[PDB]
């Protein structure tokens, strides 16, 4: 069948097809989470350990982790879970769909694999280069952790380090940097101060109202007592 090999370290993927049953014998009877040595799968895959991630069958149905069968079953699935995306469907809506079991079998049409251990010889399409991350950290804490900044270092200046510059299709010069989140600014401190002040004013108003009511009751009771004595 076909194979989808992904290298998280380098962010590279490649499609591989095998038609020899002897090589595929290693993957058969394995499960979605188990690891398979790449020695059987070709010769250039020596020293490479592959971790299964999933795959589809000859009808396109995906494999579901936990279904300990090699066949296809029907399950009632929640939206957002694997094998049921449920885009455009209502909240709390479930659907009965067909999924294949987690056990590898010849009925599969493709397998998804992840390189967990690198072998002696690199593969020309996977490990030669690495695709850089497009977006850097956006949270202030993440930026501080990335550059090992202290509590006094200005995280603002380090954002320009990974800002990406480019030329628009018109030929214009443009640059883009992320907006930092969870960054302490004077406005946040002012908002906190205003919250505390509002709490203080509420407490003071309640105390004053209670005192005024007690005074009114005391005055009325004094008047009533004076009336009673006569």
């Amino acid at each position: 069948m076909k194979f989808n090999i992904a290298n998280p370290t380098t962010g590279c993927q490649k499609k591989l097809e095998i038609d020899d049953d002897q090589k595929l014998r290693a993957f058969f009877d394995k499960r979605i989470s188990q690891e398979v040595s790449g020695d059987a799968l070709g010769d250039e895959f020596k020293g490479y350990v592959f971790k299964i991630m999933g795959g589809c069958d000859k009808q396109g149905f995906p494999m579901k982790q936990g279904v300990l069968t090699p066949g296809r079953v029907r399950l009632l699935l929640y939206r957002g879970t694997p094998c049921f995306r449920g885009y455009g469907r209502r909240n709390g809506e479930r659907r009965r769909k067909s999924v294949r079991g987690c056990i590898v079998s010849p009925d599969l049409s493709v397998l998804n694999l992840v390189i967990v251990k690198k072998g002696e010889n690199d593969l020309p399409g996977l490990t030669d280069t690495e695709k850089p991350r497009m977006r850097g950290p956006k949270r202030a804490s993440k930026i501080r952790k990335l550059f090992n900044l202290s509590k006094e270092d200005d995280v603002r200046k380090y954002v320009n380090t990974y800002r990406r510059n480019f030329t628009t299709k018109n030929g214009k010069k443009a640059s883009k940097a992320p907006k930092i989140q969870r960054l302490v600014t004077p406005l946040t401190l002012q908002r906190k101060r205003a919250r505390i002040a509002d709490k203080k004013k509420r407490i003071a108003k309640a105390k004053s109202e209670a005192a005024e009511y007690q005074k009114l009751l005391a005055s009325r009771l004094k008047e009533q007592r004076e009336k009673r004595s006569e």
Partner: protein
Amino acid sequence: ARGLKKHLKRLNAPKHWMLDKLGGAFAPKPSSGPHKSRECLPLIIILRNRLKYALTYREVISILMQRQVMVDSKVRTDKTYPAGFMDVVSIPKTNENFRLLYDTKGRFRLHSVRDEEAKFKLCKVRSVQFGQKGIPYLNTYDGRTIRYPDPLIKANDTIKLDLESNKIVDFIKFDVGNVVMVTGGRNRGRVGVIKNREKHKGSFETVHIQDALGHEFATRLGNVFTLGKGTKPWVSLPKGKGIKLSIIEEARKRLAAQS
């Protein structure tokens, strides 16, 4: 139905709104607010149907979204906001202050009031009880809650509320000899002085009211609003002073005016 209704058919709108039969299939459904749906006058009717500042629904929304209309000294941007009895409607741009009062025919009338008279309103007390921590409070029939009320104030009394400070500045006890206006029933909008009160255990109480011309009528306790102490109302009444005129005398006056 499976839940709250959001529409109001025009024929089902209260008759005192005076909506055209063929104006449309729907009427503005009053929003939740201090006043009940059947006993309110939405701002859309006031601005479009009554004052004619807006010629359309869209114009009403446009006027209101500029923050130009205030109800009880607070800016309201909701077209279907329920404005009811004794409420003050002010438009600072036009220097207009209105008080919502029932005319002799039982329909809300925008009574122009002075600047001083626009700083307060009257409210009817529903009940007085103890809140959390034992704090006494009372609630009015316009959805208001006031803590630490005067111990003398009790249910069915009228309190003078200062809108600027949101404080009770005076109150009227419900008693015989007080000028009142009827806020419900066939006698809605009439003004007179209470003569006697009939109380029936486990049943509604009947109030007997005498008009300034000696005409007598009776209504339920919940339909009586006290307007002052004695015979002088604390607020200016609309034209007619709550005097219901028979159709014969109305026709006589109309014919006299014609000539």
